[PDB]
Amino acid sequence: RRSKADVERYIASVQGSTPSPRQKSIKGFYFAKLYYEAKEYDLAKKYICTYINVQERDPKAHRFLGLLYELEENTDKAVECYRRSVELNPTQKDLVLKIAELLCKNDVTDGRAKYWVERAAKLFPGSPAVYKLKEQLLDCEGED
């Protein structure tokens, strides 16, 4: 049970001890996670963005922003964030499957779903999770 007031007290502590713009921004992942604990999703997005601005190559921060968008069923923004996270740390094979799953769940008509299913198939050979997506794509194929 974390309240808005609890998170504000921590932000105030940071402001009192490390008050520069970058110093406040570099605590923004902590602030975002605490607001998430406290169900303040808009504020969590605001603060993870301050952190990404000063630590742009941190793959965990884009992934967390992607998680926030995914929870809102904002497919395009979630995919954008997960794609950036993968680019920064491509050991996250899981995010390739996640992107394929999100696109297939949302809409299989702009063509991105096929692209990501193929990449996921390569990273997870024989995966039934991937085969389910390939079946869905085959079902919606047009006829010659």
From Swiss-Prot:
Write down which residues bear the modification named Phosphothreonine.
T18
Q: Which domain of life is it from?
A: Eukaryota
Q: Which N-terminal residues, if any, form the signal peptide? A: none
Q: Residues bearing Phosphoserine?
A: S20
Q: Where in the cell is it found?
A: Nucleus; Nucleus membrane; Nucleus, Nuclear pore complex; Nucleus envelope
Give start and end residues of every TPR repeat. 25-58, 59-92, 93-127
| Domain observations | The PPIase cyclophilin-type domain has high structural similarity with PPIA, but has extremely low and barely detectable proline isomerase activity (in vitro). Only about half of the residues that surround the PPIA active site cleft are conserved.
Q: Which family does it belong to?
A: Belongs to the RanBP2 E3 ligase family.
This protein's name: E3 SUMO-protein ligase RanBP2
The shown range, given as first to last of full length, is 2 to 145 of 3224
